[PDB]
Amino acid sequence: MSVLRPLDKLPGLNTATILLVGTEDALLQQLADSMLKEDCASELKVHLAKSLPLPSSVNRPRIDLIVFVVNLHSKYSLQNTEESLRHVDASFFLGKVCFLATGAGRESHCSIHRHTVVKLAHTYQSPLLYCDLEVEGFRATMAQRLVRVLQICAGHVPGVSALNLLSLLRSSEGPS
């Protein structure tokens, strides 16, 4: 089987989760520790993943948000992400997949083009954000930013749905 869908089972009672997908184990751990500092009204359950497809586990909850932390200084984070978005459903792409390109502050030692992850996000209809997780002051701005996406994808506010998040995070160049 080894497939992923965002809607198979029950979420729970005021409990959401996040699937941190990446190749670096020390960089995504500091992002996972900084999300527990900013308190909220929901129980957070951070899942750490290496590469899709995942092994068949039966104790997994309903997944609300999958972020793909790619590295701009690494092609190994991009080639595993290209194998990761083959085994996904089209219902993930209605405002539940966010991208993170790390290494955007250093424009002297970068190892993939900025237009490549824009073209990866344009044909797959995903929002693209840039942040540097090596700075502890920049990481707390990022760890604030993962919570307020997760309040939308779990449905904790009235009136704003998951496809309302896709319409606010659009990106299109000017036709003139």
Partner: peptide, 13 residues
């Protein structure tokens, strides 16, 4: 205060 919990879980459901 349990009535805010009932209204918040009712709006979430």
């Amino acid at each position: 205060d349990r009535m805010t919990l009932l209204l918040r879980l009712r709006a979430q459901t």
